[PDB]
Scaffold this active site. Structure first.
Site, PDB file in Angstrom:
ATOM      1  CE  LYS A  64     208.641  26.017  13.815  1.00  7.30           C
ATOM      2  NZ  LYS A  64     208.634  27.409  14.346  1.00  7.30           N
ATOM      3  NE  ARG A 138     209.845  13.661  10.897  1.00  6.37           N
ATOM      4  CZ  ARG A 138     210.974  14.242  10.507  1.00  6.37           C
ATOM      5  NH1 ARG A 138     211.031  15.559  10.365  1.00  6.37           N
ATOM      6  NH2 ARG A 138     212.048  13.507  10.254  1.00  6.37           N
ATOM      7  CB  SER A 169     215.421  11.172   9.533  1.00  4.24           C
ATOM      8  OG  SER A 169     215.297  12.427   8.895  1.00  4.24           O
ATOM      9  CE1 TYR A 170     216.588   2.962   5.623  1.00  4.77           C
ATOM     10  CE2 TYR A 170     214.221   3.154   5.910  1.00  4.77           C
ATOM     11  CZ  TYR A 170     215.335   2.389   5.638  1.00  4.77           C
ATOM     12  OH  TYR A 170     215.197   1.044   5.382  1.00  4.77           O
ATOM     13  NE  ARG A 171     224.141   4.495   6.933  1.00  2.84           N
ATOM     14  CZ  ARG A 171     225.317   4.891   7.408  1.00  2.84           C
ATOM     15  NH1 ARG A 171     225.518   6.166   7.709  1.00  2.84           N
ATOM     16  NH2 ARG A 171     226.297   4.013   7.577  1.00  2.84           N
ATOM     17  NE  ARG A 172     219.611  11.578  12.304  1.00  5.14           N
ATOM     18  CZ  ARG A 172     218.966  12.622  11.793  1.00  5.14           C
ATOM     19  NH1 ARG A 172     219.304  13.084  10.598  1.00  5.14           N
ATOM     20  NH2 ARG A 172     217.984  13.198  12.472  1.00  5.14           N
ATOM     21  N   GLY A 178     211.140  13.418   7.343  1.00  3.28           N
ATOM     22  CA  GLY A 178     210.585  14.565   6.645  1.00  3.28           C
ATOM     23  C   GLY A 178     210.755  14.413   5.147  1.00  3.28           C
ATOM     24  CG  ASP A 179     214.209  14.946   2.977  1.00  2.51           C
ATOM     25  OD1 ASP A 179     214.691  14.481   4.032  1.00  2.51           O
ATOM     26  OD2 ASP A 179     214.866  15.673   2.207  1.00  2.51           O
ATOM     27  CG  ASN A 265     227.126  16.329   9.378  1.00  4.24           C
ATOM     28  OD1 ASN A 265     227.845  15.331   9.351  1.00  4.24           O
ATOM     29  ND2 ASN A 265     225.978  16.403   8.714  1.00  4.24           N
TER      30      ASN A 265
HETATM   31  N1  LIG Z   1     222.208  22.609   7.169  1.00  9.07           N
HETATM   32  C1  LIG Z   1     222.438  21.204   6.972  1.00  9.07           C
HETATM   33  C2  LIG Z   1     221.299  20.324   6.445  1.00  9.07           C
HETATM   34  C3  LIG Z   1     221.506  18.998   6.258  1.00  9.07           C
HETATM   35  N2  LIG Z   1     222.777  18.478   6.561  1.00  9.07           N
HETATM   36  C4  LIG Z   1     222.981  17.038   6.361  1.00  9.07           C
HETATM   37  C5  LIG Z   1     222.710  16.220   7.588  1.00  9.07           C
HETATM   38  C6  LIG Z   1     221.344  15.684   7.318  1.00  9.07           C
HETATM   39  O1  LIG Z   1     221.045  14.533   8.042  1.00  9.07           O
HETATM   40  C7  LIG Z   1     221.394  15.487   5.847  1.00  9.07           C
HETATM   41  C8  LIG Z   1     220.037  15.398   5.159  1.00  9.07           C
HETATM   42  O2  LIG Z   1     219.340  16.596   5.247  1.00  9.07           O
HETATM   43  P1  LIG Z   1     217.872  16.628   5.855  1.00  9.07           P
HETATM   44  O3  LIG Z   1     217.305  18.014   5.610  1.00  9.07           O
HETATM   45  O4  LIG Z   1     217.036  15.606   5.118  1.00  9.07           O
HETATM   46  O5  LIG Z   1     217.936  16.309   7.408  1.00  9.07           O
HETATM   47  P2  LIG Z   1     217.295  15.020   8.077  1.00  9.07           P
HETATM   48  O6  LIG Z   1     217.049  13.942   7.046  1.00  9.07           O
HETATM   49  O7  LIG Z   1     218.271  14.438   9.076  1.00  9.07           O
HETATM   50  O8  LIG Z   1     215.949  15.413   8.813  1.00  9.07           O
HETATM   51  P3  LIG Z   1     214.538  15.275   8.112  1.00  9.07           P
HETATM   52  O9  LIG Z   1     213.770  14.121   8.721  1.00  9.07           O
HETATM   53  O10 LIG Z   1     213.664  16.492   8.315  1.00  9.07           O
HETATM   54  O11 LIG Z   1     214.746  15.029   6.637  1.00  9.07           O
HETATM   55  O12 LIG Z   1     222.201  16.485   5.322  1.00  9.07           O
HETATM   56  C9  LIG Z   1     223.855  19.262   7.054  1.00  9.07           C
HETATM   57  O13 LIG Z   1     224.951  18.781   7.311  1.00  9.07           O
HETATM   58  N3  LIG Z   1     223.630  20.688   7.251  1.00  9.07           N
HETATM   59 MG   LIG Z   2     216.177  13.160   5.159  1.00 10.06          MG
HETATM   60 MN   LIG Z   3     217.488  16.700   2.453  1.00  8.45          MN
END
Ligand SMILES: Nc1ccn([C@H]2C[C@H](O)[C@@H](COP(=O)(O)OP(=O)(O)OP(=O)(O)O)O2)c(=O)n1
Ligand SMILES: [Mg+2]
Ligand SMILES: [Mn+2]
Ligand SMILES: [Mn+2]
Length: 327
Positions: A64, A138, A169-172, A178-179, A265
């Site tokens: 943010k 979330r 984020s679930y698997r982590r 968030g989704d 990543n």
């Molecule tokens: N610019 C980006 C966006 C996402 N991802 C990858 C890593 C993320 O973990 C995954 C899923 O995208 P999310 O937007 O759902 O990211 P998160 O699930 O980790 O966070 P959130 O809880 O907001 O969904 O795709 C990536 O490599 N580069």
């Molecule tokens: Mg996600």
């Molecule tokens: Mn996503």
């Protein structure tokens, strides 16, 4: 005292005030808490890794801060007290970036009413407006779990041995999501084909899938569906759902990519290029052969990666459990 990060603090302060008066006092705490930590800092923060290490700043707060920092320019119009609360209002609309937000601000939009009624709207942004309240929050991990099982058992009716895994984020091991990003494939590499189209409508009929962002996106051999879903029963909120269908050959690297984290990543790709490789969401492949002068002499070939562990092996990295790759 003296605060080095004057630029970040002023915006976060106006931002925190706006959230507390708007109803969210939980997040306003996170901003306020973050501000105190920022003030007590020896040097100006200008990067992600540096923002994360600071006591009191989480890894979702850092993203943010970076967003605010990158989108600082031009900041010419009006004042931060009247702009930023409106900028954030438009920013949180799905499919809307900070540039799209300040754009709507330049045109003279101050409410979500003005955006719906007059503003040009993406097929994506329209959906966000409808479910804006529900998309601001979330979801608990448990809610994500039963969404995982919902898609899983719905797909397994078509093919018994079909595999569905949540890679968001679930698997982590995150407490909140968030989704939910669901990855689907089949061990044979034969079955996954065709399932995508006949499963979406299957889930759409039962009222589960409410809206569609992209009906179908074809990237290489991967299929992606972005959309919205709502669990059955009263008191249920709309959750954005992302489905990705991959061949079993690319599963290991697709699993790793979608697993996260985002900064993880980026660090993996940066590490892969130093060992003479490249890590995409499809497969870990050797970097393009170049002569000493940087001319592209040869094509890069694709390395075989059946398991997520073999990717770590080939990169000379000790394996890292998904909970330990949340950067
Ligand atoms: N610019 C980006 C966006 C996402 N991802 C990858 C890593 C993320 O973990 C995954 C899923 O995208 P999310 O937007 O759902 O990211 P998160 O699930 O980790 O966070 P959130 O809880 O907001 O969904 O795709 C990536 O490599 N580069
Ligand atoms: Mg996600
Ligand atoms: Mn996503
Ligand atoms: Mn947004």
């Amino acid at each position: 005292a003296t605060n080095h990060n004057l630029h970040i603090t002023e915006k976060l302060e106006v931002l925190a005030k706006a959230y507390s008066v708007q109803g969210d006092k939980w997040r306003a705490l996170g901003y306020a808490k973050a501000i105190n930590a920022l003030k007590s800092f020896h040097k100006p923060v200008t990067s992600y890794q540096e923002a994360c290490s600071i006591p009191g700043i989480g890894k979702r707060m850092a993203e943010k801060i970076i967003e605010i920092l990158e989108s600082g320019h031009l900041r010419k119009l009006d004042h931060i007290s009247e702009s930023v609360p409106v900028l954030e209002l438009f920013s949180n609309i799905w499919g809307a970036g900070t540039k799209t937000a300040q754009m709507w601000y330049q045109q003279g939009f101050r409410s979500l009413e003005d955006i719906r009624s007059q503003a040009s709207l993406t097929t994506q942004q329209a959906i966000g407006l409808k479910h804006y309240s529900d998309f601001l929050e979330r979801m608990p991990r448990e809610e994500a779990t039963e969404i995982e099982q919902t898609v899983q058992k719905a797909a397994q009716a078509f093919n018994s041995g079909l595999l569905c895994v949540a890679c968001g984020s679930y698997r982590r091991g995150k407490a909140t999501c968030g989704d939910v990003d669901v990855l689907i494939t089949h061990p044979d590499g034969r079955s996954h084909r065709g399932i995508f189209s006949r499963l979406l409508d299957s889930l759409r009929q039962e009222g589960f899938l409410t809206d569609d962002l992209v009906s179908q996106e074809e990237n290489g051999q991967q299929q992606k569906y972005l959309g919205v879903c709502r669990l059955p029963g009263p008191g249920r909120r709309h959750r954005r759902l992302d489905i990705i269908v991959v061949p079993y050959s690319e599963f290991a690297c697709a699993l790793l990519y979608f697993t996260g984290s985002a900064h993880f990543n980026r660090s993996m790709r940066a590490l892969a290029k130093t060992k003479g490789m490249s890590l995409s969401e499809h497969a870990l492949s050797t970097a393009v052969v170049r002569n000493t002068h940087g001319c592209k002499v040869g094509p890069g070939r694709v390395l075989p990666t059946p398991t997520e562990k073999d990717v770590f092996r080939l990169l000379g990295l000790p394996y890292r459990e998904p909970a330990e790759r949340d950067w």
